[PDB]
Amino acid sequence: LNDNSASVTDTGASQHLSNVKPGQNTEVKPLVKHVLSKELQIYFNKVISTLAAQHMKQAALTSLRTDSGLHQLVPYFIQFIAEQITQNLSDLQLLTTILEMIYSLLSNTSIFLDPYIHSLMPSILTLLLAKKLGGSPKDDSPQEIHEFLERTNALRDFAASLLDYVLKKFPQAYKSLKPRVTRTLLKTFLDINRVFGTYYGCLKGVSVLEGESIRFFLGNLNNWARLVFNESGITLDNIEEHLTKFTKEETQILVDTVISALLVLKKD
């Protein structure tokens, strides 16, 4: 079931040159709703509705992880993962459950997931580098600031350790998602006008890389610190109450996490 003064110098020079460079397509058919049997979509709605009741959630997670025969529903899962990520980007328990079912499908060794590597990496790279994740910080309280910060940092620390799981599950796609992901992180990291949590996700994604690539961020870290922390001629003495974008706690988190990954380059 497949899908059943000249203007030709643009449909031939940049429509079949900037399309033949990323592969080629002949219209694989996702949706007519005749391609799934009755029991298959019964199982599909029974697993998508449950994602006393944590037992059913873990049963659905393990049924995604271990059972075989869901090679037809695997494009319908990455659709209803992406819409519950880019449409419901405020609830951290649902984003945690969606990352759990991402990890559960990513451990199923009885389904082929190498086609879908490019439509599953932006979910991991957007729950790691979001401008906002919770969105409702419940402000006018430093305790609530710290609680919302830990609640939104748990998702960064989980999605960063799901990016390292997919850089090892698919080693045949090396030199096709290692430079792409480190280029995404180098592009998102090298600016001033971003929120703290995006920088934290960037540095944790740097941490879940390895080797000379971390050394590749050694040179452009000094000017990054001099722009994001404002050491305009400082003599490192009044550092506790000097700085301008951040607060003291998240600057301490940044100086902690920037050497939490720098220890890998001096242990060898």
């Binding site: 990455i78 819409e83 045949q172």
Partner: protein
């Protein structure tokens, strides 16, 4: 957050197709799920070795006429 060129032009030139895609899912591009080919860890040489043999033969002409 407007000083990035390649992300701003990607927001502008794709702003019509992504609205239709996200309205279709609740029922160049990198998130059309069905039409994607994976990548191989190693594919063999089929054209580069021809020109490699040709400029290697030119290199054997370049070594001052020794066969």
């Amino acid at each position: 957050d407007r000083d990035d060129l390649e992300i701003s032009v990607w927001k502008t030139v794709t702003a019509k197709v992504r609205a239709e895609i996200c309205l279709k899912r609740t029922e160049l591009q990198e998130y059309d799920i069905s039409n994607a080919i994976p990548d191989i860890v190693y594919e063999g040489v089929n054209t580069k070795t021809l020109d490699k043999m040709e400029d290697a033969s030119v290199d054997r002409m370049l070594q001052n006429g020794i066969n």
